[PDB]
Symmetry: C5
């Protein structure tokens, strides 16, 4: 039972933060990058290293202690550091003789969610025989059906640096208390197109005028911003991610 | 059928929620969601695709709570492609984009399609090449002539079976389908990027201009889909179609008819 | 003419539903919907395309129930029929790369449709005024170099099928008061077809005064071109490929003076 | 001026319909609508384009019915590029896309621009390379300096002559042009596809935020255009700009002013 | 500060019109609007771009009529000036193919503008934290590996021209309450510039409460980046090319307490 919104000065609050990307971080200098990508010699021997796998980012944000629940009403969000991708001089692969370095480009996934509980995930595997590495949380008891839909693969995005992007998507059969948005753009030559502005707001209310309700006074923010790949001089390629800004406005809602 | 009032009350609404798996060909026990690698005939008349090389339309007939004249009326749809991020696996015996590079991602010709109706989707056959010999186990335009390459009105069918109706020879029949709402996009070209959006905040309203949605004959709801995302290229250069499942959530209400 | 009131009642509306087949050239008895392989002239002066290499505008004149009252075209639903046929990448096509699938239809496309109460009015514009157009086509006559940009002599009516080459003629924007036309040229050898289908989309044909095309002599004119791109066979030769277009038009009776 | 009421009555309105032809260079008696083949200087400093290699802005000054204080106010515009299908001629001395293939279509850098005003379009000069030597017979930014490569406010002109103002060194002056409405898109890149839409159902309203359109000084309407569609590549690989004409229909009404 | 009513009367509005020139590096006396040609470091760790190879943010502080009342920015018209200059494909560029025209400016672009009542607030993000940024630039200091994703130490104001490298800094979304900013990064070596011009488009600068940027000390801050892409020289060497941006801002007097 969702009842009335509380009003008055005390009745609203705001959460602001940045979620850093988790692209694999293969050494102490490579925060925001994955390990260079290697290709298995056969389909059945696919065995990616942990540091080669971008993962979902998640933050649980504590809210002012309050039945009243905080209701998330609006979101401003954008990718932070878009202009860093203009560094075309840091030992990249020249576009042609005497040219500048190739910029970050290729397959991207840009995703964010705001919810009153952890994002609920459904597993789908490109190749069910992929051996996922220690330190990741991946679909278990994979079968050939996992390549299209195996309803056994349910999870909560409840840990950082853990749930690989390629194994998991938001579960559309759940997530009633979350609003999620994502775009996959695939292809090795896809250009990043990244917009920034402090004038754009997304409303998180459903068709009944109710936003995510924050259980235990916690707000869940999740993101992925794989921008593409950086190509080194040698031709090796690494995923590159960037952080995402969130500003969420919340109001006190009475519930029964 | 005269369409009369909508029934109200707690009893008057129901939801259907499900996923339709893709039917891309499934050439062996490890390759669910993929087709056989594509081979090319040497002439038009020798085009003889194997069944497991042909993506087919997916269909589900969903029984609804029995009525009875009341009919369930489909009012809204939420839908999306499930597993979009799986296409980020660029390390599983793909063809390197260049020396030392990552594997080429799934890309190229795609068809994304879905429909919700109160009866089977009605199909019209159109053939790229009327001399194509379609394989046993598929249902395809019969008595094809050269006119079948542009329009032959003999080729009518119902999407009434799974793993049967090849995508490439059938489309929704625009002269029929009064009791279905359908939506599709073909994006052709060997290098087209998949652009796949997901969100739980988007709803499609299924009502026509008179405020009437599909009416479920015999208390059955028909959901149909194709989500050929593109082709996967193996190390050898061979290419296979790759498809993904589609989620449907449909809200229905009871409607009286006479 | 003064346009007056719309008639009402059961008898006052009618509907036209049909398809227009493409006219791409049809170079032999197996290649309906395709053109002849494209050949290139050595010079502008030697450009001499054969008839079966030239896509043409499609047109249908549809008689309406006999009726001063005129039928007024109010709405249109339209789509390209057979879009999924372009997924046949296994039929004598040039491979994308070694061991790869066949190339799909792609490259230059023209998608066009019109609904009018009389024939579509055409204006001729020539890429190359020295092109010798073939017998059996209807093309701009007395062409001069000015025909490459605008020669007002080249006026015609789209009044015959398999006759008016697409590359020679466009809708005349200076006329066509009694037609609604819509078209997009997307040029380039690698452009991807993007073809949408749905039975939920309607185009309203009324102008800014609330008046649709009025059907002179109780004839409705439908015109289309749907050159989807080119098919490349294993030799590398390329042919235009077209598809049919569905039309459903709702009409109502209108009094005029 | 003080803008007062609009006149009404049958003869309070008039229409202008015409077309503007492109001025691409016209290098010989057979090549109207094309430029000369494009060549490239050996140094930045030696850039010296031929007149016939430089597309120019098109302009027409259209006399309106004599009024006298009343002025014609331009209210709406319909406009269209004329001859878009001509670009389907891929069989006329073109460079084949690959062995045995069709000719390459017109593609690459385009500039599509149109304006409607009650006086000549006001131009600001900006030079890619301030040391470019512009040819006799063109009107170009004079006394160019390195600052002309980004902004030199000395370079002001009126679009008041045809075959004169090269496209590449002039743009509409956004600091002026209060009595004109202008619209343009530059799409740059050697493989850019032309995307040209035609319809007689699209109208642009020319009224500003105060409900006032361009007011035609001396009963003259000014129409300006550029429609460089891309480049045509011939068999040798050499490239020429190709332009097309633009149709304009403008509706005007009588406005009292003081 | 409490925001109260807008003042009316003829005296109550003003307008600012200006252009901001690009700061791409200007490697010599002939190359205003271009950067130095781009060179690539031999190792990732040794990235060390020269100052004249780094485009920077442009900023102008514009004094307003001296006035508690404050000038409130309400609307903006803006566009890139000189878009057609990119049609110069004949000035010692690299031919796209044998006998072809020169490659146009293309590839990675950043188009950005802001209007505020105080300096734009910046947050630093580094592609490579071991990049040695050159003397004469203002760049994130005490860089660590966290600087490659988010190091909140890297805060700055866009308070100087020719100083803040584009690749190091973005608008700080956690600040800028009194600024409206808009930007698009389009990355990739072959992306085509798509540049629209028109004098008919207005951006409204009011927030959801109907309040625009309020100009502290009667100064308006305008900021811009218009890196259009790269020019490729005949040798293959590449230089960033930028263009100026026009701003017209309408302001009104607002009483505050
Ligand atoms: C951004 C960056 O750090 N780029 C460098 C990359 C990068 O650190 C790794 O690829 C991340 O996984 O490393 C480059 O050098 C590597 C390792 O130092 C290569 O020379 C590879 O070294 C190996 O030892 C290895 O397995 O990592 C052997 C392998 O054969 C080498 N690979 C190649 C393609 O030569 C790199 O080029 O990948 C340097 C780059 O600046
Ligand atoms: C628009 C323009 O001015 N283009 C010229 C460029 C340009 O001035 C610089 O690249 C700006 O940084 O210079 C070109 O010639 C240069 C020198 O003027 C080259 O020959 C390079 O000269 C060097 O002395 C240098 O380091 O700058 C040595 C270097 O090896 C040379 N680089 C190459 C690739 O040959 C140029 O091509 O870059 C001429 C161009 O018109
Ligand atoms: C995803 C997958 O299984 N790929 C494998 C394919 C397919 O099994 C068949 O082509 C299906 O027809 O077969 C290969 O021999 C090949 O063609 O190079 C090896 C490749 O690793
Ligand atoms: K007319
Ligand atoms: K001005």
């Amino acid at each position: 039972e969702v009842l009335e919104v509380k009003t008055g000065v005390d009745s609203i609050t705001e959460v602001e933060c940045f979620l850093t990307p988790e692209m694999g971080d293969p050494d102490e200098h490579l925060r925001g990058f994955s390990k260079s990508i290697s290709i298995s010699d056969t389909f059945e021997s696919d065995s990616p290293n942990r540091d080669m796998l971008p993962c979902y980012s998640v933050a649980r944000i504590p809210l002012p202690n309050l039945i009243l629940m905080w209701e998330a009403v609006t979101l401003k969000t954008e990718v932070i550091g878009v202009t860093s991708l203009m560094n075309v001089h840091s030992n990249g692969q020249a576009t042609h003789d005497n040219g500048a370095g190739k910029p970050v480009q290729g397959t991207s996934f840009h995703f964010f969610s705001v919810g009153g509980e952890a994002l609920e995930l459904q597993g789908v595997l490109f190749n069910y025989r992929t051996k996922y590495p220690d330190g990741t949380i991946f679909p278990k008891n994979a079968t050939v059906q996992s390549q299209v839909m195996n309803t056994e693969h349910k999870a909560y995005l409840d840990k950082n640096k853990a749930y690989p992007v390629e194994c998991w998507v938001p579960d559309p059969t759940r997530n009633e208390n979350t609003r999620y948005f994502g775009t996959l753009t695939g292809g090795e030559n896809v250009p990043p197109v990244l917009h920034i502005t402090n004038t754009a707001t997304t409303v998180l209310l459903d068709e009944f005028g109710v936003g995510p309700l924050c259980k235990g006074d916690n707000l869940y923010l999740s993101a992925v911003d794989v921008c593409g790949m950086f190509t080194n001089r040698s031709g090796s390629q690494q995923w590159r991610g960037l952080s995402r800004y969130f500003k969420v406005q919340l109001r006190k809602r009475r519930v029964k």
